[PDB]
Amino acid sequence: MTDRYSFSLTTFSPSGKLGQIDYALTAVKQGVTSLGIKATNGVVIATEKKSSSPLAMSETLSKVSLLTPDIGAVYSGMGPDYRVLVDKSRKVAHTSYKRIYGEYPPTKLLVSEVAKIMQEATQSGGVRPFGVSLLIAGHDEFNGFSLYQVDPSGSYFPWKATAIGKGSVAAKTFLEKRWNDELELEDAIHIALLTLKESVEGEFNGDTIELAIIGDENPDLLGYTGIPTDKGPRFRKLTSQEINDRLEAL
Template identity: 30%
Template sequence: MSESQGNRFPFYGPQGRLVLVDSALEAVNRGSTTIGIKTPDFAVIASQIKPTHPLMEPSEKIFPVDFHIGATGAGYIGDILQLIDTLRLESQKHRLTYETPIDVDSLAKHLSSFLHNYTTYAVRPQAASIIISGDDQTGIQLYQVDPSGTFFRGSGFAIGQSSDTALDVITKGYNKNMNLEQAIELGRAAIEKALGEKPIVETGIIEPGKAFRKIRTDNS
């Protein structure tokens, strides 16, 4: 590729930031408000169900990945679905190869590498951030993976529209000894505060030794 052709794809901006990744993060910030909360006894992931045409089925926002893992995301729905399929495929490959369920850390690192590869070429990065929750031999786990491939492990995350507001609610209301109902309510409150309205929320739940499950609740 000539120098003139290379200049058509500016990887780095004046401040040394990856321009295409910043654009992907902007798309994430316009997505549905989405949260994750973890305690030693369970993890909850939840996302706003945005209104659609009255004749259309609402979009699925919480996705089972394996028996012991679930995920959600914010950003372009097409990119979210591709990344969910990537997680499912890696989980299935691990089961077939090793005859054991994949651990959550390995799955998050695989997605991190997958996303990072998009940042090393002049192609559009995946415009989605993913929150992964699961139960493995190390206990209940919660990860966030961003379009750059950066990943975090923690007890509370928020992505999507007004995520800073939602994360503030989670941070102030978090207690590692809270019960499942309190965590679900905290997640709903965080999404409601971020949006300034009572939305429909889809929630996924993982508990030790139990299958990942999800519920949908109208907050009105």
């Protein structure tokens, strides 16, 4: 035994392409569409719950995930690669930040950490890159609201709004038309829902759509009272019912 693959599996071709990263981006392109929009008082991230069988219970599969109480993530690409990145992203928020500073990391730095892990899978021995692009939305005191995209290469960029996967090119054009710097969070949810309908074939309702927000603090979701300065998570996953209420208003 032992891992005797101590050499890189991603290397430069004569044209300067990094083949495995490109091929990983291709796996992301095949992936289901997901998006994010930044409002003045919130961020929304959303995607389609493309269920494999109708015997599958698709609420048991979380495509949108809480990383910290003020940071959420969604993806396009290979779900299993996403699931482990979320496990690692949650742990690294604690080990390299909260256990040191006694507070959760700001969005850009947690993204920086996830990006690092993805870069290392692009250069380390005996591994392939991750076959996902992430959209990470969050809030922190000194930077306000932000939205980030993280690619298999490890590169990350801040966005006002964007989409990734299957119908990304059309979706990005849709978002360019509707985005402005004065959107209130409800407006961005409405736009997200409109954008998402384009790339969705079959049923389009609160049970086939997964959608969360980074918005106001939710003291009702904290679980305890009596510390004035703990005001609760800003991350909130919308219910099946909440989504459907906004689809009649559509």
